[PDB]
Design a protein around this nucleic acid. Sequence first.
RNA 1: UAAGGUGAUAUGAACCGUUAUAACCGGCGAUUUCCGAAUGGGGAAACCCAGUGUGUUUCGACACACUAUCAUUAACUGAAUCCAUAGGUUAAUGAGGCGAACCGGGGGAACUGAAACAUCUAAGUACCCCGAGGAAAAGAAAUCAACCGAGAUUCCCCCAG
RNA 2: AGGGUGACAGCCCCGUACACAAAAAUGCACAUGCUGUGAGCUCGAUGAGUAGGGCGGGACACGUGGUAUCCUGUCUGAAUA
RNA 3: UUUUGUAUAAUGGGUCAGCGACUUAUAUUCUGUAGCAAGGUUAACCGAAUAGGGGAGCCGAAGGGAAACCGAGUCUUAACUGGGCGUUAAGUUGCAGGGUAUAGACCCGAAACCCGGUGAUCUAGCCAUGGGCAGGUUGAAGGUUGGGUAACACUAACUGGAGGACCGAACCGACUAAUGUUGAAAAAUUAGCGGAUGACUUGUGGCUGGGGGUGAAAGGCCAAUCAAACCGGGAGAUAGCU
RNA 4: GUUUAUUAAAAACACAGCACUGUGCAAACACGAAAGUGGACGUAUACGGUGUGACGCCUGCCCGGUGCCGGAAGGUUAAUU
RNA 5: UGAGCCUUGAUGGAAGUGUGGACGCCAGUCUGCAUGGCUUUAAUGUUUGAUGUUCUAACGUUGACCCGUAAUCCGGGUUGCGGACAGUGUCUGGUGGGUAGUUUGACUGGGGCGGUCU
RNA 6: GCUUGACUGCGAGCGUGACGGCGCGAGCAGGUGCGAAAGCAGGUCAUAGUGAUCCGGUGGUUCUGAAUGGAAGGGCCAUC
Lengths: 149, 77
Amino acid sequence: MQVILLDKVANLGSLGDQVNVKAGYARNFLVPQGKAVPATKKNIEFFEARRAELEAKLAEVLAAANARAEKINALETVTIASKAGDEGKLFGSIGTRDIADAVTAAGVEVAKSEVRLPNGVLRTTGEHEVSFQVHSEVFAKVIVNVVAE
Amino acid sequence: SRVCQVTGKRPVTGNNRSHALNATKRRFLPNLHSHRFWVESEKRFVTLRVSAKGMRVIDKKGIDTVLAELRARGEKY
RNA sequence: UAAGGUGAUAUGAACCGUUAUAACCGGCGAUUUCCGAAUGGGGAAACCCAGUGUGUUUCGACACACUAUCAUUAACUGAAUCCAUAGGUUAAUGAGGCGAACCGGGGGAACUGAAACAUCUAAGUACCCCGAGGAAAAGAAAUCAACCGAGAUUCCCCCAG
RNA sequence: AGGGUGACAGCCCCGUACACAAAAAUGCACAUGCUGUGAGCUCGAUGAGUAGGGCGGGACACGUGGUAUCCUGUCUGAAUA
RNA sequence: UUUUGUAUAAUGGGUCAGCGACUUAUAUUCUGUAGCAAGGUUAACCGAAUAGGGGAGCCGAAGGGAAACCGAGUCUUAACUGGGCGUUAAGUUGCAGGGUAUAGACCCGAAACCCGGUGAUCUAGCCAUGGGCAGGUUGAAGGUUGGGUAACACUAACUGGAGGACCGAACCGACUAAUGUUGAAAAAUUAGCGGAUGACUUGUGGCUGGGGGUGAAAGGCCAAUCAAACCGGGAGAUAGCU
RNA sequence: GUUUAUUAAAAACACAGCACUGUGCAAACACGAAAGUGGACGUAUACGGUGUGACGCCUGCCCGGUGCCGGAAGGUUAAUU
RNA sequence: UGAGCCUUGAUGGAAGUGUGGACGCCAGUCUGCAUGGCUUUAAUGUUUGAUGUUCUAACGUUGACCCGUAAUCCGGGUUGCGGACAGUGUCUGGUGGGUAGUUUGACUGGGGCGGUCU
RNA sequence: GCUUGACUGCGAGCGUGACGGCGCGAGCAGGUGCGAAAGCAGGUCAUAGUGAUCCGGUGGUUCUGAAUGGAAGGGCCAUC
Ligand SMILES: [Mg+2]
Ligand SMILES: [Mg+2]
Ligand SMILES: [Mg+2]
Ligand SMILES: [Mg+2]
Ligand SMILES: [Mg+2]
Ligand SMILES: [Mg+2]
Ligand SMILES: [Mg+2]
Ligand SMILES: [Mg+2]
Ligand SMILES: [Mg+2]
Ligand SMILES: [Mg+2]
Ligand SMILES: [Mg+2]
Ligand SMILES: [Mg+2]
Ligand SMILES: [Mg+2]
Ligand SMILES: [Mg+2]
Ligand SMILES: [Mg+2]
Ligand SMILES: [Mg+2]
Ligand SMILES: [Mg+2]
Ligand SMILES: [Mg+2]
Ligand SMILES: [Mg+2]
Ligand SMILES: [Mg+2]
Ligand SMILES: [Mg+2]
Ligand SMILES: [Mg+2]
Ligand SMILES: [Mg+2]
Ligand SMILES: [Mg+2]
């Protein structure tokens, strides 16, 4: 009695691993109570077609927008800015929708504040490339041109 | 009728055989048990009179198939 | 088919016939009480007692038909549980019981032989049980052979006491 | 061939050899129809709680023997031209 | 007939007539006989059917050795002066007979073992439901009332109606004697005898089945029978016995 | 009171009473390969087995033997591995 | 809890003001505990058997209830109790006149006893 | 005193038994001991001191070996 799993399952469980358990546990508890299945071989591909049409399928289907920053590898036009101040230095901060004002007409239009650098956000020159939240992995690159008026 | 509903296993005859080799008619009869099985294809408990081995057979072929026999052989279940 | 007939003990009576409906013989039908698988219920076989349909210049009641169980199928119903299954009624099909041997299978003795007796024998015999056919069973090699070859099963003669 | 007829019958009777016969119901063959039914070619697929094994029995002429082969009550259990 | 021996007072037969016991099959050997002869003969089958075909095969012409093997020799042994078994005699197939083997095997006969059935209409026990016990005795508990006690105790009449109680018919039994014993009767008759309101007795129906029942227990009873019923079968059990 | 129906009616069996011993209830025990059932519509003041056999006065010694009961050490010890 | 492997501490960013355990060659120094400009050792993660607690979900229920159902059966369902026990199948040791089949010699001045049997 | 003839293979020819078997035996071959030698020795003065067959054990031995080569098992000799 080997059988393969569904839900978790105490001292062996793993949503689909390859266990070998006493037949009692199974024909008395696991199946007929949906948690496992006879490894009828027919099945050890029916549930290995998954381990391939998934753990290397949809784990590849992730990669179709590399860094997402595809043809945005030469900065973005600088419509306005992000602000300045202190007659020389800096003084003003990013309102909860104010690092787009600049890159305000490129990709797609949003308005949210997924803050990444928990500092006072350094006040100096201007043009800085950190990252920003573009996904649960990759990154991007753009610059910041101030406004002289 | 001590008879395994899945394998057809009924009692057989044989001798005993002492040291002196004395035959004495006897029976071997199967390890029956009659067990409640869950189907899920039927949302019910069907309870077959089965010998172990009869059991080891469902454990493999699978209930929905074993009951597929019986039905196709006429048996009640 | 016919010039003679109405079986026998067994006459007699009253009749039927002789050129084709006398009788006799063969094919096919009709009728076929009651008991009996007996099947509407019962029961001490040939008896008792029903239910539902019908049916009458006298539509009381009394006669005629249907009504057993089980299996497959179908329709309609339909619990605990709301679905669903179980269950329930109806219908259409089929089975039932009998009977020689041979036949396949399920069980399976002992007397006796061994000059006693237990392994062994009698013997898978007697017998009980189930199933079937004109035969049954078996049967197209995971069989033999022996370095050549043979080519399913069945039966006979050898091989060989 | 045989049987009978007042004793033993080829030629008295019934038969016998031989040659014939069915309106009907059936048996078996064929030749047809009806309902089925599947045919031939190519490409596939090749019978797992099975084979095998432990234990206890039973079959094999073979009495467990050095004992192959077969069946299985119990417990186990492969390979895949 | 059996016996050392039977007139035997040891077995058997009343008598007659009819029946009544060494067979049959297959193998196997010998003898007789016939055919063919180092050869004889076919089986199944085919069939032109007692022919003919069929030579599969069997027996014989070669033995010795456990065997490999050798071979008129071979084995024994290292080898035999030698020793054992062989080479020097015809066979084979029918047919008839004498034996033997396997079969009931010359015929009749057990007590029994085993298998499947039929029997609780006799009887044992139990179950349901029904019936019976003339007549006569004894007179438990309890009650009432007196007498008695301080009160109980106690006591007397009466009342009451206990009991596997007493006597005794029916009814159930069966202790003794005689009769009977080719009976009136396959268990009785007659005179006596025990129980007789009880663990009584009895009708109808029911249940218990054979290594089983039932049994106040005798191995009793289970259809005129029981240390394992009856009927049919195994079955012509076996019979070193008569 | 019972008994050998048919050679034994007794001192035999039974008996009320006594004891031992088993049984917690799906009881022990018994019929039955089982299901089912008696025990019992009972429950230890009950049910079974065994022996003794009213009652009176009593019922002593022996556990080596056999049987039975209890025993968590060791020795020996089956299938199994 | 008996044994194996994987591991992080034992055999094969300095010195001073401060601690439990110890075969410590017989009087060490250690194994660590604070600080301060492949082979002799302990715990886990674990793999493998033994023992014990408990669980529930096989299985038991000769408790109660519901329905099939006007039913002391059965079945399904609910619930309560018990529960990997009990029970049963196969194998296996013991016991086992309850039952079964048998055996239990001959000679002999009848038989038995005694005695004898080459 | 010296020694292993209590030897191995055989055996004319007798005895004695219904049989199974038992006994006696000169002599032959090989090899051995004692004796200078002739010669003696195949247990013990002789006659009891024993157990057929089956089954199995051990050693030897290609004899056998179920397609073939092996092996198992069998045979043969010794012995339990
Ligand atoms: Mg009728
Ligand atoms: Mg009827
Ligand atoms: Mg005998
Ligand atoms: Mg056929
Ligand atoms: Mg195939
Ligand atoms: Mg005399
Ligand atoms: Mg005289
Ligand atoms: Mg005389
Ligand atoms: Mg009666
Ligand atoms: Mg009285
Ligand atoms: Mg009286
Ligand atoms: Mg009288
Ligand atoms: Mg009688
Ligand atoms: Mg008889
Ligand atoms: Mg016979
Ligand atoms: Mg006879
Ligand atoms: Mg008498
Ligand atoms: Mg008397
Ligand atoms: Mg008592
Ligand atoms: Mg007494
Ligand atoms: Mg006394
Ligand atoms: Mg006995
Ligand atoms: Mg016998
Ligand atoms: Mg004698």
